[PDB]
Ligand binder design. Structure first.
Ligand SMILES: *[C@@H]1O[C@H](CO)[C@@H](O[C@@H]2O[C@H](CO)[C@@H](O[C@H]3O[C@H](CO)[C@@H](O)[C@H](O)[C@@H]3O)[C@H](O)[C@H]2NC(C)=O)[C@H](O)[C@H]1NC(C)=O
Ligand SMILES: *[C@@H]1O[C@H](CO)[C@@H](O[C@@H]2O[C@H](CO)[C@@H](O)[C@H](O)[C@H]2NC(C)=O)[C@H](O)[C@H]1NC(C)=O
Ligand SMILES: *[C@@H]1O[C@H](CO)[C@@H](O[C@@H]2O[C@H](CO)[C@@H](O)[C@H](O)[C@H]2NC(C)=O)[C@H](O)[C@H]1NC(C)=O
Ligand SMILES: CC(=O)N[C@@H]1[C@@H](O)[C@H](O)[C@@H](CO)O[C@H]1O
Ligand SMILES: *[C@@H]1O[C@H](CO)[C@@H](O)[C@H](O)[C@H]1NC(C)=O
Ligand SMILES: *[C@@H]1O[C@H](CO)[C@@H](O)[C@H](O)[C@H]1NC(C)=O
Ligand SMILES: *[C@@H]1O[C@H](CO)[C@@H](O)[C@H](O)[C@H]1NC(C)=O
Lengths: 142, 49, 49, 138, 96, 40, 48
């Protein structure tokens, strides 16, 4: 259940390991998918079958007003649940500070961070996906 | 009227997260950004159509 | 910051209003796990050599 | 010796230079429990390829529905023998148990089919057994 | 004229309910976007002349001086596979 | 690979002691199968 | 029209275990092929 540099019988990789429901016959050491990468492995010290899946990842899109208008930006984690970006607290984007969140919002396009959701609709200014759009302005409804 | 908006991370399709393959991929120049750009050009058009 | 990531992705010190693709996030591994069979004894290479 | 044993081996009259030897437990003995006039069809494949002799096999419980059945099954790998020799021909061992110099007359029957270099498409089910196949030249 | 229109639009329910094939012109869009991506993910199994198509076997078995000469075969064929997909998608997108 | 073709001829031998058989070839490989019981 | 992947959230708990062994959409995703949602939902298209 944790991301690791695994090596089984010399087969190095990077992924998370889980108990399989799969039922390898005694002659099988590795299980495989449509890209011929190893999808599952039999643990040679105990003969248990482990599923291998790549550690969690996705695309990241950044939403900005005009840089002359402001430097502040919001970030969209593509296809990702907002229960999972707090687990993405090393990672490839080293600007960890956006994890401070507080205004985290789930779109069906992805988890959206740094933009505050508001009930009153507008014209679409920047398109997010799945009926959402984002814009830079003062709400100041109160 | 439209087709499924698709994006590909070429540095992840081409190289299975290994750094040394990622350093060889830079030898090819901007090809991976052109693929990203062209697929983005299609994906922003589906919402125009 | 994610703005600086888009400035390098566009190769521009000014970015206009919009939404821009950037390099994927990827949870990196915390440790190695090496799993050979716990074989006890050295191979007979020292006879055949 | 108060025992059933091979009192002499007729098969080879000499064994002059022997170069690999083995002992084992597989090669498809029998079913457990038995059933009245029920039987088990035993399948083996023998493949000789660049100095390795490879064996695959399968048990098949089959009823009184004739023989060699038009259903489906697949053979599991059994052994990989590093023998490094030319095979061009073969024979099979009968074992009539000599009951009274006596040699009480046994009878047996078996099927032989030579393999070919061929292309197949194989259907693996959601359990990962091969459950169907098609010969791309039939 | 109302009874004609009301009974004619009634047959649209059946023209859609009874046959499977009525929306074939839209199903074909979905089928082509699926078969193109299913092709693109099978191309990761192609060896392009390398000793393995699995990039971690190359990186398990070889050191840098000849690992890079095997990896570059896979960079070349994979990159061509994307170049084919993006050209095909631009050609379809211009028809849609 | 070397497979047995679908719907191909296989030679069904009966064999008996009574109280004639030439050696068989082994070209490519052999599917060998038996329904015979009692380890005869 | 029996659609394949509308683009909505794939919370990883879906992909691991049984489903990635039979559904290609997860194997696509694990290789960085990504299918995005449209801007206008099928409810907003029906509203227009
Ligand atoms: C123009 O075409 C119309 C059909 O497309 C036609 O309407 C149909 O008229 C017939 C009678 O002539 C009706 O038929 C039924 O009439 C009675 C029951 O009401 C029965 O005796 C008959 O067996 C039969 O069931 C149709 O119901 C009627 N259809 C509609 C939708 O109204 C017009 O009569 C045609 N007009 C001219 C001027 O020719
Ligand atoms: C994000 O992931 C969590 C699990 O970590 C999802 O929570 C589950 O949601 C279903 C449906 O509402 C409930 O039946 C479960 O009991 C929830 N489990 C837990 C532990 O909370 C959550 O729904 C996901 N969010 C999205 C948008 O998919
Ligand atoms: C196969 O068997 C024969 C018989 O034992 C071996 O031939 C003997 O070889 C030695 C050494 O050259 C000679 O001293 C004997 O006179 C040979 N005897 C005969 C009857 O030829 C032969 O070497 C064996 N083959 C191998 C590869 O070991
Ligand atoms: C240097 C620059 O870009 N200046 C522009 C300015 O001309 C424009 O009036 C303003 C509108 O928000 O945005 C900023
Ligand atoms: C490795 O050691 C474990 C006990 O820690 C034992 O159960 C297992 O059989 C050993 N592995 C092999 C290959 O015997
Ligand atoms: C949206 O409106 C509902 C009331 O209909 C309200 O409870 C909710 O707090 C509003 N959303 C936000 C982000 O405040
Ligand atoms: C099968 O064997 C019979 C002879 O027993 C022969 O007449 C027939 O032509 C053979 N068919 C093929 C396809 O081998």
């Amino acid at each position: 259940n944790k991301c690791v540099n695994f090596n089984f019988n010399g087969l190095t990789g990077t992924g998370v390991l889980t108990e399989s429901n799969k039922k390898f016959l005694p002659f099988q050491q590795f299980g495989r998918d449509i890209a011929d990468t190893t999808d599952a492995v039999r643990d040679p010290q105990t003969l248990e079958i482990l599923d291998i899946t790549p550690c969690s990842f996705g695309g990241v899109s950044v939403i900005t007003p005009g840089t002359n208008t402001s430097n502040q930006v919001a970030v969209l984690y593509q296809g990702v649940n907002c229960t999972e970006v707090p687990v993405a607290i090393q990672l490839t984007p080293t600007w960890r500070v956006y994890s401070t969140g507080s205004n985290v919002f789930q779109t069906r396009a992805g988890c959206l961070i740094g933009a505050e959701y508001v009930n009153n609709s507008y014209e679409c200014d920047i398109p997010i996906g799945a009926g959402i759009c984002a814009s830079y302005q003062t709400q100041t409804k109160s | 009227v439209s087709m499924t908006k698709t994006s590909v991370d070429c540095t992840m399709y081409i190289c299975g997260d290994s750094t040394e393959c990622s350093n060889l991929l830079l030898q090819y120049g901007s090809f991976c950004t052109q693929l990203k750009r062209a697929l983005t050009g299609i994906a922003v058009e589906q919402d125009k159509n | 910051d994610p703005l600086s990531e888009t400035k390098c992705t566009l190769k521009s010190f000014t970015v206009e209003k919009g939404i821009y693709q950037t390099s994927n996030f990827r949870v990196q591994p915390t440790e190695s796990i090496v799993r050979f069979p716990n074989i006890t004894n050295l191979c007979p290479f020292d006879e055949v050599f | 010796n108060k025992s059933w044993m091979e009192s002499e081996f007729r098969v080879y009259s000499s064994a002059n230079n022997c170069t690999f030897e083995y002992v084992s437990q597989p090669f498809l003995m029998d079913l457990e429990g038995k059933q009245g006039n029920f039987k088990n069809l035993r399948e083996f494949v023998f493949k000789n390829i660049d100095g390795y002799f490879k064996i695959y096999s399968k048990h098949t419980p089959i009823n009184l529905g004739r023989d060699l059945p038009q259903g489906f099954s697949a053979l599991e790998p059994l052994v990989d023998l590093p023998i490094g020799i030319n095979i061009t021909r073969f024979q099979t061992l009968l074992a009539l148990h000599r009951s009274y110099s006596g040699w009480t007359a046994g009878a047996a029957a078996y099927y032989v089919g030579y393999l070919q270099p061929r292309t197949f498409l194989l259907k693996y089910n959601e359990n990962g057994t091969i459950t169907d196949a098609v010969d791309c030249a039939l | 004229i109302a009874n004609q229109f009301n009974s004619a639009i009634g047959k649209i329910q059946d023209s859609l309910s009874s046959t499977a094939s009525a929306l074939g012109k839209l199903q074909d869009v979905v089928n082509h976007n699926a078969q193109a991506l299913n092709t693109l993910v099978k191309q990761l199994s192609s060896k392009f002349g390398a000793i393995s198509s699995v990039l971690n076997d190359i990186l398990s078995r070889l050191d840098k001086v000849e690992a890079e000469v095997q990896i570059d075969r896979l960079i070349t064929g994979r990159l061509q596979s994307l170049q084919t997909y993006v050209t095909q998608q631009l050609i379809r997108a211009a028809e849609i | 690979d070397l497979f047995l073709p679908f719907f191909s001829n296989v030679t069904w031998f009966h064999a008996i002691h009574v109280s004639d058989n030439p050696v068989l070839p082994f070209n490519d490989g052999v599917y060998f199968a038996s329904t015979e019981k009692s380890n005869i | 029209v029996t659609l394949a992947d509308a683009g909505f959230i794939k919370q990883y708990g879906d992909c691991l275990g049984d489903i990635a062994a039979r559904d290609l959409i997860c194997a696509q995703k694990f290789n960085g092929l990504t299918v995005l949602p449209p801007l206008l939902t099928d409810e907003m298209i029906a509203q227009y």
